[PDB]
Symmetry: C3
Subunit: 306 residues, 3 copies
Amino acid sequence: HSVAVIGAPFSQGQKRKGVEHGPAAIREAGLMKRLSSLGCHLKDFGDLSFTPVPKDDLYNNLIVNPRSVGLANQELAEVVSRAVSDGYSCVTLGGDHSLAIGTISGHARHCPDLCVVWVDAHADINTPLTTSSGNLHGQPVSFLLRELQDKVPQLPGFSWIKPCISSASIVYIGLRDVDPPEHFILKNYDIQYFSMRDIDRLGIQKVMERTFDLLIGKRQRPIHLSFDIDAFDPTLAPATGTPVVGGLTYREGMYIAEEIHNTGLLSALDLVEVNPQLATSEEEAKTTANLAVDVIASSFGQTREG
Amino acid sequence: HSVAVIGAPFSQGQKRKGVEHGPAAIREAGLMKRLSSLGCHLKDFGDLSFTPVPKDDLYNNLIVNPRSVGLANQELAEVVSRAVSDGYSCVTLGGDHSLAIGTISGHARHCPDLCVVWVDAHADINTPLTTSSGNLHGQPVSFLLRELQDKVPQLPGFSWIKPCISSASIVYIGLRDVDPPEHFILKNYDIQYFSMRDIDRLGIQKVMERTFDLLIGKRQRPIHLSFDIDAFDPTLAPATGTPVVGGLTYREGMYIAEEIHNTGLLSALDLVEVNPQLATSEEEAKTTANLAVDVIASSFGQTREG
Amino acid sequence: HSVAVIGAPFSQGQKRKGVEHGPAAIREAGLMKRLSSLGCHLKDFGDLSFTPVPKDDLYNNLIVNPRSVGLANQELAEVVSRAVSDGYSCVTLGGDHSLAIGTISGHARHCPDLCVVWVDAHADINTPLTTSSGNLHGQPVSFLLRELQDKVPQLPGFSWIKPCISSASIVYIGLRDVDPPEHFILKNYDIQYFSMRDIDRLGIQKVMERTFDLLIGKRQRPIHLSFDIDAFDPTLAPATGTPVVGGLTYREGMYIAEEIHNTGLLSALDLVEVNPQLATSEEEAKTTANLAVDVIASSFGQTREG
Ligand SMILES: N[C@@](CCCC[B-](O)(O)O)(C(=O)O)C1CCN(Cc2ccc(Cl)cc2)CC1
Ligand SMILES: N[C@@](CCCC[B-](O)(O)O)(C(=O)O)C1CCN(Cc2ccc(Cl)cc2)CC1
Ligand SMILES: N[C@@](CCCC[B-](O)(O)O)(C(=O)O)C1CCN(Cc2ccc(Cl)cc2)CC1
Ligand SMILES: [Mn+2]
Ligand SMILES: [Mn+2]
Ligand SMILES: [Mn+2]
Ligand SMILES: [Mn+2]
Ligand SMILES: [Mn+2]
Ligand SMILES: [Mn+2]
């Protein structure tokens, strides 16, 4: 079992400085040793340097850094595509969540039947026509879903993207801050999700059962886990750009990762939105990065029973 | 759609200074905008000024401020009754919990078949003969329950109260600090409650299901939600006079409020016992008031899924 | 009902200074009054003074303080035996968890069909041949289980010990930090446990039901509750030597204790590993000691409903 680790220091998917230091903070929290201890054979690609784009003006007076986010994701997809083809399970460290455009596109290139577990306080499914922020980290799913493309206009730097996934192939877990147009999109296309409310009702065990039943109940498929650290309650993960009260507990996050591992199907994992500069202290920064390592390690087989 | 907001800066139901600043703190946390955004048509009655009573001596060498609490509740009942009769759902901001004597009486003046969901760490059902503190905020239910009246002596200032609400018409949620005579009363009159222990066992979904079955399982009834902020764990709501460890989680509180909304029957809501002066910091004060706004907003339709 | 309180300041079962002050901190947090209030007739044995052993060198260049731990446990066992035979339910305040060798041996001396509920983040079942720390507080179960005895070598000071528990007679609750050799031992001897993961899945109510089914499902047996404070999440019990994130909530801890009380079979209780010196503040120390008093009180009948 080989694991590739890729640092993707994206910040241009949003407006708050510092999320580009996420990958280093996660490494400093001891990621590599933890993965080695589980018996992972590791390839560290280091932190990628993405090619900047000159004069990357607003798109339609609203969407920020479209060409930069586009090109960085194109380059990221290439590295992800290569690593999977060489047989690595791919861990990408963020960086803001717009990089899921790149990792999922790269992952899907040769594994078009992949499925997605998107763990997040947010749906990240605004389109360029519904976003109220202009921040691409709140739009990545819209570029990836096949059924939505008639409603997603073409952004500069995005033409290389071929929507690779059906709306029945993504399940959300932990949603509690959803824009009305996203709610419309989720219902209109029958996209399955388990909000914090669904977790309160069902418990995390049944949520995972039903998640896997929806996605792999009929056939084995490579799993893409896109994990936004803000899925966790801000008391546990404060160092992040859009914290929302009432998130996953520590145990719930571990349980999710444990079940991901137990399928035997994890093929790629994003760990995004850790922003050490948004912590009010270095303990808060470190606790967030430490939590990130716990998720990744649990996702690759670390247990709570030895 | 119409919602009335009434500030009741009640402190004489207890002895700790500052709870009378509860309504202002909740307003400053943005209550009105939150209600407006949900589509509530709003009438703000402002903060009431209650008529003082001269020489309001202890009753029986124990019960404090009886006439002041009695008259203030009489005046509050008049305002609530008027607002409910004009078609408003009535939100009352406290202030200590003795004001539920006024809001429930006033509410019942219009809607006599109302039922009550009492969310609280405490039962608040001591009588003047059982109270060990003399504080009327730990007695209000005793003046309201029809089955108890012959064990409830007549206090000065209380003669206007005609308690018409049956013991089968109130359900408690969150109880963990119950005085022995209150335990006796709950058992002797077969009053239903879900303690923190019951929540631990059943989970909050089943608790709400069973609550509504008991209250509205046979017929539709207007619901009075009397929500003591101290139902929440002290970590989440520190700014309150009688905090008790082991309370509701944030998610549990939201879920209760959501189920209240989903009945379509909410006719009045109390949000009581926020005391900004008991916070160790402005942050603890603001988090408590923000939490109060979350409960109220969720009770009137705010969701965690957009 | 009669309860004996025994202070056991031991701290030679591990390497961190200050756990020997655990009993005084628990007493100072109001233990005796809380117990009196429940109707417990109390005998206070005070804090025992254990006979020191000179030149108590490492065993096999690894195991620390063996004769000291051996002798202190012999002396503790005598006191527990005497108290149980004289009709007391026995509360032993620690002190590190190696003293369970003594309390369980003393208890089993005249109640040989006793069963054990071990509430702990850890399995405490390393042997002198598997421990990586040499600390006896992480080995006590190995000296107590009949089935393990041919693989547990003879330590100086330990010859008085006669293993008094079959592997089907102990159930663990709360495990999240288990050494691989301990995991091997647990599976190899089919010792039943409920990890934090099991609690996440089943809920604490089902965990307790199944716990009692296994232990007392066919016959009534005296119950020995060995409660390591570190079973609780570190946010609730920070003053302890080996904290592990993702522990029991406050409510879960109370629920365990309530269910122990509800069997009517509790015969002895250990409350171990409170180390007030490990708190970063006096507040952190007191909250840990207060939590310890809450467990003990709930185990002898304190309720959350009056
Ligand atoms: N839905 C979001 C949040 C996206 C977060 C992206 B992620 O990747 O961390 O899930 C988007 O930008 O599209 C926002 C949309 C609406 N805004 C509301 C808001 C914006 C600014 C302020 Cl000051 C207060 C409130 C915040 C959430
Ligand atoms: N049951 C109470 C508390 C009710 C709180 C009212 B509410 O509205 O906040 O639910 C009452 O005054 O009737 C009290 C009755 C008993 N006392 C016990 C006590 C009093 C003082 C102290 Cl310092 C320590 C303990 C505290 C609770
Ligand atoms: N299993 C333990 C801990 C048992 C704790 C006993 B108790 O009573 O508090 O449950 C043992 O000493 O046997 C240890 C075994 C392994 N070590 C790992 C470790 C040791 C030292 C350091 Cl600095 C970092 C990690 C710590 C736990
Ligand atoms: Mn997010
Ligand atoms: Mn996201
Ligand atoms: Mn209360
Ligand atoms: Mn109250
Ligand atoms: Mn232990
Ligand atoms: Mn332990």
